[PDB]
Design a protein around this ligand. Sequence first.
Ligand SMILES: COc1cc2cc(OC)c1OCC/C=C\CCOC(=O)[C@@H]1CCCCN1C(=O)[C@H]2C1CCCCC1
Length: 128
Amino acid sequence: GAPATVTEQGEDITSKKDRGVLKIVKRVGNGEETPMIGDKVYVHYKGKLSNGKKFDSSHDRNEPFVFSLGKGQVIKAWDIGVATMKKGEIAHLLIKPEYAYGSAGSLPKIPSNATLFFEIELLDFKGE
Ligand SMILES: COc1cc2cc(OC)c1OCC/C=C\CCOC(=O)[C@@H]1CCCCN1C(=O)[C@H]2C1CCCCC1
């Protein structure tokens, strides 16, 4: 399903072109402008491990997920991926461990060398 489609049709959005972060736009946003480093960013997301054993949604907390882009509050793949998104965009991201929690992982929630999948909705973003 959705992750396999991302393997298949995903744009490689890494600078190194190592397929570390793959993206499909599933619903198009609006506005020419994507977030810049520093912006306060508001999203909804659904995330899971490739192993299918953990799922997490912003909705589980009945409130948006907020973070400052590029300010190392989230995994590298989010800083890279959300910078490509427009307001109102829903995107799918498939992420190799190098752009997530690496060989150490983040036990027990994230195992060593985990691939992650996210659906992200970019709700809004404002300047510092
Ligand atoms: C291991 O840390 C978590 C990871 C995720 C959610 C968390 O709690 C809601 C987590 O615990 C509290 C810290 C919350 C977020 C810290 C960093 O998380 C992140 O950078 C990415 C991107 C932003 C949404 C959350 N996220 C996560 O890695 C989630 C994962 C939870 C397990 C399934 C894969 C998603």
